[model samples]
Target: IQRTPKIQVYSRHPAENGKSNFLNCYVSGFHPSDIEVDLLKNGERIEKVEHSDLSFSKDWSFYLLYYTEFTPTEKDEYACRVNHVTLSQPKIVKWDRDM
Candidate 1:
């Protein structure tokens, strides 16, 4: 069965007054367990990500989460690009610091 993944992009709580923050791209409910993901910064492709992990639900559904650590600056933009078999088009989720 083919299932499309749901994507959510959000920031983790900062340690000290926005000193150290992390961005997470969460993809869930996807099937076949094969997907491509990319992290973007300021609309440019980020070649490397700090950490990533995958897990499975009790019903055998899949979840993927990627993490990157950074200090937020003014108007910084971040995004996650997801490619999976179930999706006709690539999924993109963006998070802006100004928001």
Candidate 2:
């Protein structure tokens, strides 16, 4: 891996009441293409998440991108967990409903 992944966690604006909203985790600028991304809620691991296939930069600068999409329902805890070879430890990015 030429570059370590930088993980970002965020949500779309204008979240409506009782409607669906999205939480996005973008892991970008990494390499080797063997990584794992997962979602967690209230400190518990969550299944049934969606991920994008590895994407390449137009310049092929040894960069790659991956994303995970999940629906947010309750005001519980949420986070994105990323495991990559370039990381000495797992990278965790968190989101809160109160924010």
Candidate 3:
């Protein structure tokens, strides 16, 4: 694992308005394996979330994948924030509504 964490925020299925999909936050490639990942809606933390068991990459970097159910819509902004020792502040990654 390196110092800074690598974060990926996206939906499991193609996002659509009024559609149910799993919002995912994949936090990986970080050192020490001590970190926090949260799924946020409109700048607030969301619950009913689930996390995969901590795992490692080929290089031994720790990674975790967490998700929650949500209905996509035009008025809401979804994002994930990653907190790690190497970051000056929490790294916020916004989801792009895409095809």
Candidate 4:
């Protein structure tokens, strides 16, 4: 069965302009595994991404953590993009700066 993944975009540290931090894309609660998770900047894919090993939860759903080092600036937009079998189109989630 196709399971829809939940995407969460966040920073490892408190989000502040010009402060170096880790931008993360946490995709969880999905089945059949193997989904594409990208850390994006202003709608463009960022390089040097890091990923966690694929794992399953108690419910047997899979999860993955993708991240990258980034320094937030005033003029940039940060987001996470997900591509999974359950989605008809790519899913994009924006980082909440109000964190």
Candidate 5:
């Protein structure tokens, strides 16, 4: 990875209910064989769902993390890609519920 894997995240609510939320990842240095993305809390992995419903792009170069369609839970916690060894740090994407 050049420099660091930069990303931007957002919480989306289509219904405007405030609880109906989603996550978006604008990943930089996203190559075919880079870091993988995931979600977690404390030490447990988060069960996330995909919303795009479209086939993954095989272009080897896309600038977005997996558009995860998930509802924010009380235990809502998020992390980013884990490649090879293990994640050195979690790019905390969401957790307003816990606060």
Candidate 6:
């Protein structure tokens, strides 16, 4: 069985003013060659923030860190995935520190 390429990430609670949040993503692929990653926010695209510069493992992996403050409101769609391969679906993570 083969697992889809994925980026594991965590969401930080919004600030006291509930105006911003932190997004962290760690991406890894089976193939150590090259992994093309993309960051999506509210169905939109975020520049840079690729696995190549994010993080990597001794075995040759990928990682990334994304931060944003512009948005329509709370409940944003933050997900990461590889654009070249279809092995794995995109991973979506939401933040609800209040809960």
lDDT per model vs. reference? 0.79, 0.67, 0.87, 0.87, 0.48, 0.49
> What order do you get sorting by TM-score, best first?
4, 3, 1, 2, 6, 5
Kindly list the per-residue Cα lDDT of model 4 for residues 1-83, writing each as its tens digit: 77899988878989878888888889999988879888888888876899999998999999999989988888777889999
Q: Which scores greater on lDDT, model 2 or model 5?
A: 2
Q: Give one digit per residue, the lDDT tens place, for model 1 in 1-99.
A: 877898888778743344878888888898989998878886677655755567888978899888887776766667899999988888888875443
Model 5, range 1-99, lDDT digits (tens) per residue?
323445665555542333656656555544443455665554565565453322224544434455666655544345544442224664555434322
Off by over 4 Å in 5: 1-3, 14-18, 41-43, 51-62, 74-77, 81-99
What is the per-residue lDDT of model 6 for residues 16-55, given as tens digits with 9 covering 90 to 100?
4455545555555544434555556756677744222445
**Local error of candidate 1 at residue 47 (angstroms):** 2.7
User: Best TM-score goes to which candidate?
Assistant: 4
Question: Best to worst by lDDT, what's the order?
Answer: 4, 3, 1, 2, 6, 5
- Backbone N/Cα/C clashes per model: 0, 0, 0, 0, 2, 4
The TM-score values for the models, in the order shown, are: 0.83, 0.74, 0.93, 0.94, 0.48, 0.52
For candidate 3, the lDDT comes to 0.87
Q: Residue 53 CA error for candidate 3 (Å)?
A: 0.3
Model 2 per-residue lDDT tens digits across residues 1-99:
266877777766444545567777777777776788877776777555666666767654233333344555656767888898888889888875544
Best by lDDT: 4
Residue 97, model 6, lDDT? 35
Question: After superposing candidate 6, which stretches have Cα over 4 Å from the reference?
Answer: 1-4, 12-17, 48-56, 59-72, 84-99
In candidate 2, residue 51 scores what lDDT?
65
lDDT of 1: 0.79
Q: By TM-score, how accurate is candidate 2?
A: 0.74
Model 2 stretches with alpha carbons more than 4 Å out = 59-75, 96-99
